[model samples]
Target chain A: SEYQDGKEFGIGDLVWGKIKGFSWWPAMVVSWKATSKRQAMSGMRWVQWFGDGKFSEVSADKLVALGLFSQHFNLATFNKLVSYRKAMYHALEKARVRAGKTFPSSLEDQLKPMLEWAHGGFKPTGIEGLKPN
Target chain B: SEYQDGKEFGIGDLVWGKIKGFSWWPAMVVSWKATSKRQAMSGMRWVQWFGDGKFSEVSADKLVALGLFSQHFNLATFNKLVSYRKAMYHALEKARVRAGKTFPSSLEDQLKPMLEWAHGGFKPTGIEGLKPN
Candidate 1:
């Protein structure tokens, strides 16, 4: 899917903004302000803007996907990993209950390998496309 | 009652300390530390000090009354007032339960007069005995 839709822009989402007269800059999606009635009538959802230390807004048409497609998907892996962990935990609980066993204190230790794999054994660094101002 | 005893010293209590080189200075009793075993055996409680912006510990014998007998008592009034207020509140709750009434919004307003009197209609400015170093 495309990141152009308003759904992609969320509070706290880090993104690159290509403001006119300046190169792409890294900024975080700080907030959404209610658009004027006229703008709303024209189908604008709200005024979305980004801020590193200062604020700048770009029209929807000006937004671009942050990083490469693979890089963009890298951030999405966190949600998938969390879901997998929850399912694993639920299954483990079910098995323990059927066997009448208490939760092992080493459950965390057991999950370390899975956690390491999910996190790719390192932190996710966002795209390098935009240079800092 | 004489305020000389170590019983009078407590964390956050404002007091005056008569340091050797300096005049009596206004300072808050910031903390207490356990006296060394040798000092403790001598019947000294942990070293007690006052800090305005700086720390100066006084020997148990060095602390004098913070203000005039009545003014020193003005600070004590808060403890007495708090006890009195708590009793008043408990009694009010009992009566309210007997009458089956919810706590009144005006309870705070009712206590305002007592608060003012306890505060002596103004703030407590600690004794001016010690010049600030």
Candidate 2:
């Protein structure tokens, strides 16, 4: 969050650096040696904080951090699924099916009728059904 | 669709034209006089059939054929919304606000807990909360 110089970083790092200078340039980490102004500006706590003032770890393959909590349960997944209307379904499917029943139980209820509608309305052709004549 | 030529067309027309040739064609509406074979191969209905065998009318001055039936209930919107994941919510919000209750009421119920969670989690920076230092 705090964009500062000498901050640990790599090519495919996901540091919460402020995308400054230009409106179009996406947020980037500068040299692991540069200072970031994100924290000073937003006043929000970041999810990750490296021990050596790195503030970001190479835990993810690229910008999109992978894993259970960071990848699946985080805002990115929530935003993506919500934006598309299957937020509930994706979350339910992604989360422990049984645990998915808690806090986010609404998604389960929401998915019920949807599954019903799909079954009643149109069942997608399976691979076998799609075989060439 | 089996992209053929001079089969049928018009400018601002929604003819069942096939996109032929090239590997990357974003799909273009050829001249109004341009022909489209979108219908010949799909075996699916084009939803509109202009009289005089026009097969496509200038009903829409632009490529977008807008209206309750054509615009709201078409595949484009479905694809866009679905691609993003908030398909259910948008469909409900758009349908009736009340008739929103039917078919896609799942969105409201889906949104209920989200609303609660958002409420319990973080209240937005109300306009009045923005006071100059």
Candidate 3:
């Protein structure tokens, strides 16, 4: 994840997208039309959101990268962030199975919080990484 | 393009993702983790927003497909929506080139309205297609 490296991404990579009525939420890159130098145009990407399974066509100017779990977090705390990320999908998979059968009564229930957690505002409790000069 | 017939998207396909503060916005599919069923997990998708170039990992539950322009739209009007989409990128490309050399003070100026326009709420003004009874 260049999110932890040089801050870049590619097709099939994980990243965050902005959603209306909420802070930045997690979304995936669907594709883009690039010109040269790995430089793609703005407002040209198609991404899918993790919450509510909503899709949007946002410009690059509004997109951002989620920061990594601070190494300062003990493994216990780190897993909470990591595991929650996975749990969001499990809830979705179950809904998918139920769709042709019986739709879940509260699919949106399983979705809302995860999208909130993905927002950059809330940071896990841990020592700060470092001070910038 | 599958939008015309069956509806689905791939890792590099054009799709819309939801952004906070706006209707579903344009973005690119960056990546995801799939188990079985070409059906990747929801909330596991990593997408890059076309607006502000923000990166996010949103759940599939929050994603949707951008419908194709109705066939009834005259070719001229069809291009208006399509061409406007392209103009957004042109604005971004010029900013990208100016980055290391000189940062534009009004960069956000070029970006804001495009993002506002990308919202699904608005449709191109044109004759309505044949309606359902």
Please, what is the whole-model Cα lDDT of each candidate in the order they appear? Answer: 0.35, 0.27, 0.40
lDDT of 2 by residue, A42-69 (tens): 1111222221233321212123211122
State the lDDT of candidate 1 residue by residue for B1-133, as single tens digits. Answer: 2233545554333344565654443344432322112223221223323211223445545554433323323343334455434333332222222233342235456654433432342223323321111
Tens-digit lDDT string for candidate 2 (B12-52): 22222221331110111223222333333322222222111
| Alpha-carbon interface RMSD for all candidates, in angstroms | 29.3, 26.0, 9.6
Best by TM-score: 3
Best by lDDT: 3
Give per-residue CA lDDT, model 1, range A48-87, as digits (tens): 3322145443443334443332232233333445543443
The residue ranges of model 3 lying beyond 4 angstroms of the native Cα positions read A1-133, B1-7, B19-21, B33-44, B59-133
Rank by DockQ (best first): 3, 2, 1
A5 Cα displacement, candidate 3 (Å)? 46
Better of 1 and 3 by lDDT: 3
